[model samples]
Target: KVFGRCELAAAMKRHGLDNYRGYSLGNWVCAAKFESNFNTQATNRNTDGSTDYGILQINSRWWCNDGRTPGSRNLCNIPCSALLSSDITASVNCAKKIVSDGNGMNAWVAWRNRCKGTDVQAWIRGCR
Candidate 1:
């Protein structure tokens, strides 16, 4: 739960954003800032009672992919603790995958309300 500097660094490195160089990282951190303000532990609830979870505001169901899960179709929401460490970094990839190009942050067209863990294409479209 308390994974610190080195651990975080390793995790980030494994995602290929070791130095935080490209727009993806910036977009990622920016998205995190905009989404969860970089808070590793954050959560939110939608009008339907579904809850957003974790630092990046990842929905528990998508993060955990379990319907009976909290953020799933059951409780308010639940954090996919298993995926938290990687999803944050994987977000950049998800963002990139949307653009479908290796160009860079320039690829991200704009910054809008693309819900985390959802709107996979919508998120990319915002960037596009």
Candidate 2:
């Protein structure tokens, strides 16, 4: 599913991401903006030879299993392809799992580069 900024904010919030694991709905939408630009089908290759899939750029190495990543563990116990869907359940669930592991918003480059101190709450304004 391709979502506009506000729409994705509502989706994440509806999916229970608000303040999830100390990360806000803002943090997620912000990361999704930079990570995948709200494109659910997004996919990227990493220099480490692993891949990132879906709107949140869930990784093949440690998160989802592509059955190909050199160090894939399928910690989320789902196929990498599962994240690329119109329904964001798998993607969002795995994303929650990634955060719940304790690193939360600190795991991605987007968090460090653009999401660290941005006013994320504004993204959700009028988005209900």
Candidate 3:
């Protein structure tokens, strides 16, 4: 697990996600906090019978394969379980694609619900 907030930000930056595509670093950090608390293995079953996977909580309906769920767009063309690993490279890669296809971080419900319109700078307060 990451030792602290700065570490998380640094990790994100190392993976070329530090505002890599017109999104804010703070918004990314804020969304990760609300979605899975930065836990890579996090998963949640949505009310619509869809499941969210990994730190960004990407959906099985459109992003990854859950095996049992049919008609998945599988846009990322990867297993949903791949998102559940400690190494976030795969997740970040898929997230970039998702954001490219959708409305930036608005693809993440947590970002729309909890992170939007807020002072999210504290998420990366002291990271270099």
Candidate 4:
């Protein structure tokens, strides 16, 4: 189940990222938002034959090239095909862990400060 935009969108919604009626997936929707516009099959230049690969934007600099091989990086470990799996849950949970390690909600705190400009708790609450 290689995720295209649709699958990514669904996962985001399931995870409570539904906000963009026109672009509800938000800024960093599944890494592809920054890397490839959610194109699970995207590939781009990296100079000297190297390239960024996969829908998650795993570049060959870290061995994500060829668009199929999953690299051994923090957020890029899950293959594009399996990005929606529990194997990839670390990406979201890690963000949460970084905030409080269960002491607090880091993602919500950051989202409040950086995303909506206020209401960090509310923004994070959107996930619930």
Top candidate when judged by lDDT against the true structure: 2
Could you tell me the lDDT of residue 2 within candidate 1? 34
Candidate 4 lDDT over residue span 22-122, tens digit each: 22344335334545555545656554554544444344434322453344343434343343333334333332223333433222332334544333233
Which parts of model 3 have CA positions greater than 4 angstroms off?
1-3
Candidates 2 and 3 compared: the better one by lDDT is 2
What is candidate 2's lDDT per residue for 56-116, written digit by digit as tens? 9998989988888885689999999999997888888998888878666788887778988
lDDT of 3 by residue, 1-116 (tens): 43256766777788888776777788888888888888888899987788999888999999999986666679899999999888888888998999898587778877998988
Which TM-score value belongs to model 1? 0.44
Best by TM-score: 2
Alpha carbon lDDT of residue 24, candidate 2?
Answer: 77
Q: How well is each residue in 42-105 modelled by candidate 1, as lDDT tens digits?
A: 5666566555545445554433343444534322233345334534554434433433445443
RMSD of 4: 9.2
lDDT of each: 0.43, 0.87, 0.83, 0.41
TM-score of each: 0.44, 0.94, 0.92, 0.36
Report backbone clashes per prediction: 5, 0, 0, 2
Residue 3 accuracy (lDDT) in model 3 = 27
RMSD of candidate 1 to the truth, in angstroms, is: 10.1
Judged by TM-score relative to the true structure, which candidate is superior, 1 or 2?
2
Answer with 2 or 3, whichever has the higher TM-score. 2
